[PDB]
Amino acid sequence: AQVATVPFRLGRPEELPGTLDELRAAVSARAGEAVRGLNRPGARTDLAALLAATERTRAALAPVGAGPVGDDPSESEANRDNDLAFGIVRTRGPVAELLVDAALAALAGILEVAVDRGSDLEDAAWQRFIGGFDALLGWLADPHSAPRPATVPGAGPAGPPVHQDALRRWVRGHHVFMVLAQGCALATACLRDSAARGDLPGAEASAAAAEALMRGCQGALLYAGDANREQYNEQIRPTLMPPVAPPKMSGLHWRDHEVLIKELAGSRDAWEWLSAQGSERPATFRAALAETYDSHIGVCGHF
Ligand code: HEC
Numbered sequence: 001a002q003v004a005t006v007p008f009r010l011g012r013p014e015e016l017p018g019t020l021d022e023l024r025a026a027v028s029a030r031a032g033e034a035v036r037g038l039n040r041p042g043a044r045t046d047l048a049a050l051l052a053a054t055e056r057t058r059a060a061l062a063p064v065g066a067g068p069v070g071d072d073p074s075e076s077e078a079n080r081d082n083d084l085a086f087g088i089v090r091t092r093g094p095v096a097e098l099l100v101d102a103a104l105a106a107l108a109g110i111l112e113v114a115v116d117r118g119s120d121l122e123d124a125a126w127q128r129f130i131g132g133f134d135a136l137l138g139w140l141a142d143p144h145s146a147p148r149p150a151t152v153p154g155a156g157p158a159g160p161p162v163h164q165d166a167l168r169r170w171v172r173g174h175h176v177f178m179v180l181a182q183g184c185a186l187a188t189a190c191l192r193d194s195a196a197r198g199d200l201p202g203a204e205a206s207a208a209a210a211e212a213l214m215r216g217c218q219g220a221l222l223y224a225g226d227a228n229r230e231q232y233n234e235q236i237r238p239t240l241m242p243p244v245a246p247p248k249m250s251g252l253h254w255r256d257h258e259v260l261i262k263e264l265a266g267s268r269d270a271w272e273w274l275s276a277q278g279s280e281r282p283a284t285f286r287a288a289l290a291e292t293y294d295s296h297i298g299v300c301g302h303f
Pocket residue numbers: 176177178180181214217218220221249250251252257261264265289292293296299300301302303
C-alpha cells in the first residue's frame with residue numbers, strides 16, 4: 001500500500017529449528033551470506049551505504065520463497081486477521097532461511113524512512129534497535145558463538161513529518177516485530193534444549209543471542225511508540241470521512257509472539273542454571289526483559 005512492502009514473506013514459527021545443530025545446517029549458509037553483505041567494506045560509513053548493502057545482499061541471495069503457505073490447519077482467523085492487518089504472508093520453504101530473507105527485508109524497510117527523513121529516536125535506543133539485526137544474522141551465521149556487535153551508523157534528526165509517515169513506520173515497525181520475535185523464539189528454544197542436553201557453551205551463546213534480540217525489541221517498541229504517538233497527534237483533525245483507523249495487533253494472539261512467550265515460559269529452569277554455572281547473561285537479560293515489558297505501554301492496545 002506504498003506504506004510498506006507487501007506481501008511480507010515470512011516462515012511458520014512453529015516449524016522453526018529447535019536445536020543448535022538443526023539451526024546451523026539449515027541457516028548458517030544463507031545467514032553467513034547475509035552477514036558478509038551487511039559488513040562488506042564501505043557499508044557502515046553512513047546510513048545510506050548500509051541500506052545499499054542490504055539490497056545488494058538480498059538481491060544476490062537466491063530466493064527460497066516457495067510461495068504462500070495457503071491452507072493452514074494450525075492457523076486461526078485470529079492469526080490470519082493479525083497477519084493480514086500488516087501485510088504478512090506465511091511462505092512455504094526453509095523457514096529458517098525465510099527468516100534471513102524476512103530479516104533483510106524488514107531492515108531495508110526501516111532504513112528507507114531513516115535515509116529520507118531521519119529519526120528523532122535517541123541515538124542510544126537507535127543502536128539496540130538496529131543491533132538486533134546484527135545479533136540475529138550474526139548468531140544465525142554461527143549459532144555456537146555469542147554474536148559480536150558491529151558498528152551502526154547514526155540517523156539524522158527527524159525532518160518534516162510527511163503525511164502518514166508515522167504510519168509507514170508503524171507498519172514497517174511491526175514487521176521487525178515478527179522478525180525479531182521469531183529470532184528470539186529460536187535462541188530461547190536453543191537455550192532450553194542446550195541446557196537439558198548439558199550443552200553449556202551452546203546455552204551461553206543461545207542466551208547471548210536471545211538477550212541482544214530482547215534489547216533489539218525494546219528499541220523496536222520505542223520506535224513503534226514514536227510512530228504511534230505521532231499517529232495520535234495526526235488525528236486531531238476532525239474528518240468528515242470515516243476516520244481510517246491504524247491497523248492494530250488484536251491481543252496477545254499473533255503467531256510469532258504466541259511462540260516466543262511459550263518458549264520464554266518453560267525456559268525458566270535454564271536461566272537459573274546458567275546463573276549457577278557462572279554466567280552473566282541471566283542478569284543482563286532480565287534487565288532487557290523488563291525494559292521490553294515496560295516499553296509495551298504506548299504501543300500495544302490491550303496494555
Ligand atoms: C500488543 C498485541 C503487543 C505487541 C505489539 C507486543 N506484545 Fe508482547 N505482550 C502482549 C501482551 C497482551 C502481554 C501479556 C501482558 C500481561 O499478561 O500482563 C505481553 C507480554 C510479553 C512478554 C512477557 C512474556 C512472559 O511474561 O513470559 C514478552 C517477553 C513480550 N510480550 C515480548 C514482546 C516483544 C519482544 C514484542 C516486540 C516484537 C512484543 N511483545 C510486542 C502484547 C503485545
